[PDB]
C-alpha cells in the first residue's frame, strides 16, 4: 500500500510531524512592511549571483497569504510548523529601533497558527543576517556577534515566548562556515581567493565558534530571565548528512569517522561534552579557537534538543594522515568522497547534485547520534528532495519520487526509533516550493506546488500522502 504500513500508530505517542520553510525563502514583502535588507538581499540582487538574477522579494507572497498556508497546512493533517524570524524584519539595522510592523506579522501568524492548532517550533535565524551588521561590525567573524544575537533573542523572548514554546537559535551554521568563508559562494562570498577577502583555513573555524558562542549565550538569557516564566525550550538546528566507510579497512572506516567529526561534531561535541572533537583539536590545531573552561561549561548542555536537517549519504575512503600546508575547513578531513560501490551509485540524485536519495543514511545519522552522544532528545527538523525547473503543473504534482522519498526515509527513522533512538519528531522540508538560495525557483523541494507567475498553491501527491499517513 503508498503508506507502506507507515500512520501516526507506527511512531511513538505524541510524536511530532511538522513541515518547514524559512523567512527569507517564502515570506516576500523583502524591502516592505518595514523590513531592512539582509545579506541575502544585497548577495541576490547582485547579477550572476543566483540562477537567473533571481531574488527573494516576492518568493511565494507568504506574508500575505499566510493563512491559506497555514489552513492548508492543517488540512493535511500536520501539528507543528516550523518557521524562521526575520531578524531585519523585527530590527531594520539589527540594533536599536524596533519595526512594529514587523513585530505585528510575526504576532499574526504565531496566534493564527495557535487557533489553527499548529505548535510554531520558530527558529531565530535562517542565513539572514541583517546586512547593517554585516558592515557595522564584521558579521560572525566578531565574537561581538553573542551579544547582538542576545538582545535579539531577548527581545524575540520576552514578545512572543507566552506563546511560543519551541525555539531553535540556528539553521546549519556548518553550511554558512562552509559556503560563506570557505569556498565563499555564498554571502558574504569570503575565501582565500575571493574578491571580498578572506581564509578558507581560518575563518570557518571564527565563524563556527561564534556561533557557538552565540547560541550559548542567548541560552543563557532564556534560562537566565524568562523559563520561569515560559515553561519553553530552545534548540539548534545542525545538517548532518550520513557518511558511510567505502569499505571495512582501517583507512576507510577512520575516514568516515573523520568526516562525521568534521561535519556533526564539529557543533555536538561541544553541545554535548563540552569540547571540540579530538580529531579536530590534532589536525586543525593553533586555527582552531580554544573555549575557556567558562565558555565551554556555557555551551556545554546549552541545547534542550538538537535540531538535525538530513538529506542524504556518501561514501568515503581513506588515506594515510599526512602533515599538509593548511588551505580549508573542507581540505582538512583529510578525505576523498566516492559515490559508488562494487560499481553502483549509492542512490539516484534528486534535482539538487549533492541529494543523492540513500535512505538507510537517515538510519544512519540518527542511530549515530544515539550512540555516540547518550541519546540526546532529536528533532528530524528537515528531510526532503527537489525536482527541477520547467516542469508542467501536472508534471510537479504527480510527483511519485518525492512520495517514494518520503515513505523509504520515513521507514528508516521508524526503524531507528524502534530500536531506541529518542527522536521526538520529524518536519518536511518544504512545505511550499520556494527561492532555493544559489537555485533560486528552479529548485522545487515543496510538498505543495507553487506556480511563481500567479503564486496559486496546489497540493502535490506527496502532500495527500502526508494527509493520509497522517490522519488523526
Ligand atoms: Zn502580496
Given at each position: 500500500?503508498?503508506?507502506?504500513?507507515?500512520?501516526?500508530?507506527?511512531?511513538?505517542?505524541?510524536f511530532?510531524?511538522?513541515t518547514?520553510?524559512?523567512?527569507?525563502?517564502?515570506?516576500?514583502?523583502?524591502?516592505?512592511?518595514?523590513?531592512?535588507?539582509?545579506?541575502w538581499?544585497?548577495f541576490?540582487?547582485?547579477?550572476?549571483?543566483?540562477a537567473?538574477?533571481?531574488?527573494?522579494?516576492?518568493?511565494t507572497?507568504?506574508?500575505?497569504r499566510?493563512?491559506?498556508?497555514?489552513?492548508?497546512?492543517?488540512?493535511?493533517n500536520?501539528?507543528?510548523?516550523?518557521?524562521?524570524?526575520?531578524?531585519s524584519?523585527?530590527?531594520?539595522?539589527?540594533?536599536?529601533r524596533?519595526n512594529?510592523?514587523?513585530?505585528?506579522?510575526?504576532?499574526?501568524?504565531?496566534?493564527?497558527?495557535?487557533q489553527?492548532?499548529?505548535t510554531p517550533?520558530?527558529?531565530?535565524?535562517?542565513?539572514?543576517?541583517?546586512?547593517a551588521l554585516?558592515?557595522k561590525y564584521?558579521?560572525?567573524?566578531?565574537?561581538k556577534?553573542?551579544?547582538?544575537?542576545?538582545?535579539?533573542?531577548?527581545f524575540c523572548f520576552k514578545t512572543?515566548?507566552?506563546?511560543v514554546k519551541?525555539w531553535?537559535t540556528?539553521?546549519?551554521?556548518?553550511?554558512?562556515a562552509?559556503?560563506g568563508?570557505d569556498?565563499?559562494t555564498?554571502?558574504?562570498?569570503?575565501?582565500?581567493?575571493?574578491?571580498?577577502?578572506?581564509?578558507?583555513?581560518?575563518?570557518?573555524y571564527?565563524?563556527?565558534?561564534?556561533?557557538?558562542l552565540?547560541?550559548?549565550?542567548?541560552?543563557?538569557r532564556?534560562?537566565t530571565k524568562?523559563?520561569?516564566?515560559q515553561?519553553?525550550?530552545?534548540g539548534?538546528?545542525l545538517?548532518?548528512?550520513?557518511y558511510?566507510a567505502?569499505?571495512?579497512?582501517?583507512?576507510?572506516?577512520?575516514?568516515?569517522?573523520?568526516?562525521?567529526?568534521?561535519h556533526?561534531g564539529w557543533?555536538?561535541?561541544?553541545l554535548?561534552?563540552g569540547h571540540?572533537?579530538?580529531?579536530?583539536?590534532?589536525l586543525?590545531?593553533d586555527?582552531?579557537?580554544?573555549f575557556?573552561?567558562?565558555?565551554?561549561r556555557l555551551?556545554?548542555?546549552?541545547?534542550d534538543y538538537i535540531?538535525?536537517?538530513?538529506?542524504?549519504?556518501?561514501?568515503?575512503?581513506?588515506?594515510?594522515?599526512?602533515?599538509?600546508?593548511p588551505?580549508?575547513?573542507?581540505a582538512?578531513?583529510q578525505?576523498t568522497?566516492v559515490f559508488?560501490?562494487?560499481?553502483?551509485?549509492?542512490?539516484?540524485?534528486?534535482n539538487?547534485?549533492?541529494?543523492?536519495?540513500?535512505?538507510?543514511?537517515?538510519?544512519?545519522?540518527v542511530?549515530?547520534?544515539k550512540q555516540?552522544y547518550?541519546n540526546?532528545?532529536?528533532?528530524?527538523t528537515?528531510?526532503?528532495?527537489?525536482?527541477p525547473?520547467?516542469?508542467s503543473?501536472?508534471?510537479?504534482?504527480?510527483?511519485?519520487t518525492?512520495?517514494?522519498?518520503?515513505?523509504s526515509?520515513?521507514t528508516?527513522?521508524?526503524?531507528?526509533?524502534?530500536?531506541?533512538?529518542?527522536?521526538?519528531?520529524?518536519?518536511?522540508?518544504?512545505?511550499?516550493?520556494?527561492?532555493?538560495?544559489l537555485?533560486?525557483?528552479t529548485?522545487?523541494?515543496?510538498?505543495?506546488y507553487v506556480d511563481?507567475?500567479?503564486?496559486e498553491?496546489?497540493?502535490?501527491?506527496?502532500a495527500?500522502?502526508f494527509?493520509?499517513?497522517?490522519?488523526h
Open positions: 500500500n503508498w503508506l507502506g504500513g507507515l500512520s501516526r500508530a507506527a511512531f511513538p505517542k505524541r511530532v510531524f511538522g518547514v520553510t524559512s523567512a527569507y525563502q517564502v515570506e516576500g514583502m523583502a524591502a516592505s512592511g518595514g523590513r531592512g535588507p539582509s545579506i538581499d544585497a541576490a540582487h547582485t547579477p550572476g549571483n543566483v537567473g538574477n533571481q531574488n527573494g522579494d516576492v518568493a507572497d507568504q506574508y500575505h499566510y493563512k491559506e498556508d497555514v489552513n492548508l497546512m492543517k488540512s493535511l500536520f501539528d507543528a510548523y516550523r518557521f524562521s524570524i526575520s531578524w524584519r523585527i530590527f531594520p539595522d539589527g540594533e536599536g524596533v512594529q510592523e514587523g513585530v505585528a506579522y510575526y504576532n499574526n501568524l504565531i496566534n493564527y497558527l495557535l489553527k492548532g499548529i517550533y520558530v527558529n531565530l535565524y535562517h542565513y539572514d543576517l541583517p546586512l554585516e558592515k564584521g558579521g560572525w567573524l566578531n565574537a556577534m553573542a551579544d547582538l544575537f542576545t538582545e535579539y533573542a531577548d512572543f515566548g507566552n506563546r519551541h531553535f540556528f539553521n546549519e551554521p556548518r553550511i554558512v562552509l559556503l568563508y569556498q565563499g555564498n554571502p558574504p562570498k569570503r575565501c582565500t581567493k575571493c574578491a571580498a577577502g578572506g581564509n578558507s583555513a581560518t575563518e570557518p571564527i565563524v563556527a565558534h561564534n556561533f557557538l552565540s547560541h550559548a549565550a542567548a541560552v543563557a532564556y534560562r524568562y523559563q520561569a516564566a515553561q519553553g525550550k530552545v539548534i538546528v545538517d548532518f548528512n550520513w558511510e567505502l569499505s571495512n579497512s582501517t583507512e576507510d572506516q577512520a575516514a568516515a569517522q573523520r568526516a562525521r567529526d568534521f556533526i557543533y555536538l561535541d561541544p554535548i561534552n571540540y572533537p579530538q580529531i579536530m583539536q590534532d586543525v590545531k586555527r582552531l579557537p580554544k575557556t573552561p567558562e565558555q565551554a555551551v556545554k548542555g546549552s541545547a535540531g538535525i536537517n538530513q538529506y542524504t549519504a556518501s561514501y568515503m575512503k581513506g588515506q594515510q594522515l599526512m602533515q599538509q600546508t588551505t580549508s575547513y573542507s582538512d578531513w578525505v568522497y559508488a560501490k562494487n560499481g553502483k551509485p549509492i542512490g539516484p540524485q534528486a539538487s547534485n549533492w541529494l543523492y536519495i540513500v535512505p538507510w543514511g537517515m538510519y544512519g545519522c542511530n549515530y547520534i555516540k547518550g540526546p532528545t532529536v528533532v528530524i528537515a528531510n526532503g528532495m527537489d525536482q525547473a520547467n516542469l503543473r501536472d508534471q510537479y504534482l504527480r510527483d511519485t518525492r512520495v517514494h522519498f518520503y515513505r526515509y520515513l528508516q527513522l521508524k526503524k531507528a526509533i524502534d530500536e531506541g533512538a529518542n527522536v521526538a519528531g520529524y518536519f518536511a522540508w518544504s512545505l511550499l516550493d520556494n527561492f532555493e538560495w537555485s533560486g525557483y529548485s522545487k523541494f515543496g510538498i505543495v511563481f507567475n500567479t503564486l498553491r496546489h497540493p502535490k501527491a506527496s495527500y500522502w494527509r493520509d499517513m497522517l490522519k
